[PDB]
Design a protein around this ligand. Structure first.
Ligand SMILES: CC(C)Oc1ccc(CN(CCC(N)=O)C(=O)c2cnn(Cc3ccccc3)c2-c2ccc3sccc3c2)cc1
Lengths: 230, 225
């Protein structure tokens, strides 16, 4: 019904947005969570089934960014998740778990466990996530099953590989984003869903993430519907 | 500013270009080869090290006409490229291609294998996902035979098993991917290799894509810093 089932979103520009206001970089990220809350809500009522969101930026000092990224789930569970539970939104994460702070692994699992029975939009958090890592990680699993004799080298196919990716937990007809949105004027994918997004439509905007709202989402959805005409 | 080493190019708009000029589709593909000739020579002159070109339900006659272009390209285009020190290579599934086409492909490769300038890298019968699947296939076969440990599985390993392995190590990943004729999508083109590439989108139809177009892409690329 003229709505993309799965939207990927690269949330870029929090740092730049904060610098424009003469405010610290932390202030920018808190507004980014507000942006996400608005977008998550708006997308839920519009009919979108899945969104995979990705906190990525190149405006660094990696320790710093790899600091307030892992800090996201914590803050997001306290101030934003309760409302998203009220709106029937299901929360899941994709990415690597091993190197996570305890407190942020607690907030993520609690966010999942709170919302696991929810039947609305699936908000998918790409945290500590790299596309090439995802595929490599999937290759380890597949290779070990070939030695275990669970599958043959001939049995390895595009369809099979999909089941080993981090997006396997999603329903099979929704695993691949139909649209991928990137903000902050950057025309690149930065290792976001290389496999799953291989056939996706792309929307690039100069708008910074914290200024990206329901109106911005619809404008992106309008662009998408226009592509089908061409 | 300076030139990107490896440029990916999705060639699109041959049909529409012919439609505006009231000609058959077969001529649109012909003008597209002229476009490719211009771009390859131009890219070689500017100092680009690699170009990966991607050609991507037609009529039953059209495939017969499209099947004749590889031979024509070898006869009336490749010699000039060979004269300009260009090296021709392929990525994709060549074993599915017809005889007369595969033999023309091989002749272009064997003719230019010793060359030291720009590498014209044709993406033919190619799919990103299929490439990766092939990579994870051959690796798993090597794991069976005990030639590889499962702990030796890394991003670099996978890179060594992609169709782009035959390119020099430092030039396997495109720095810039150009898409022509207005479409905003990557169409399963180098998903792995192009994961960090700068993307450039232009409404210009592939046959109209010339040095001006190339230099506008290259200039756009440098404005990204
Ligand atoms: C042999 C090698 C050295 O050059 C080759 C490279 C690829 C292929 C594969 N090819 C033909 C499909 C088939 N019938 O096998 C396509 O994918 C395809 C579909 N439209 N166009 C037209 C087009 C022409 C130019 C630009 C875009 C599209 C092409 C195409 C592409 C590039 C070139 S270069 C000489 C012929 C040719 C044909 C076979 C040979």
């Amino acid at each position: 019904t003229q709505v993309p089932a799965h939207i990927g979103i690269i949330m870029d520009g929090n740092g730049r947005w904060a610098k424009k206001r003469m405010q610290p970089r932390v202030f920018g990220h808190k507004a980014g969570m507000e942006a996400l809350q608005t977008v998550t809500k708006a997308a839920n009522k519009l009919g979108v089934k899945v969104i995979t969101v990705y906190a990525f930026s190149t405006e660094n000092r990696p320790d710093q960014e790899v600091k307030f990224i892992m800090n996201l789930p914590v803050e997001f569970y306290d101030n934003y998740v309760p409302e998203l539970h009220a709106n029937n939104v299901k929360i899941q994460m994709i990415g690597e778990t091993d190197r996570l702070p305890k407190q942020t692994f607690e907030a993520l699992t609690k966010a999942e466990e709170l919302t696991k029975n929810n039947t609305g939009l699936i908000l998918n958090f790409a945290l500590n996530y790299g596309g090439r890592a995802e595929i490599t990680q999937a290759l380890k699993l597949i290779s070990q099953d070939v030695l275990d004799a669970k599958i043959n080298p001939g049995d390895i196919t595009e369809e099979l590989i999909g089941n080993y990716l981090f997006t396997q937990h999603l329903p099979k007809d929704l695993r691949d984003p139909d649209l991928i949105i990137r903000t902050s004027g950057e025309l690149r994918l930065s290792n976001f869903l290389p496999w799953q997004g291989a056939y996706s439509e792309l929307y690039f905007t100069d708008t910074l993430w914290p200024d990206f709202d329901e109106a911005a989402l619809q404008e992106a959805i309008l662009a998408y519907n226009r592509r089908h005409r061409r």
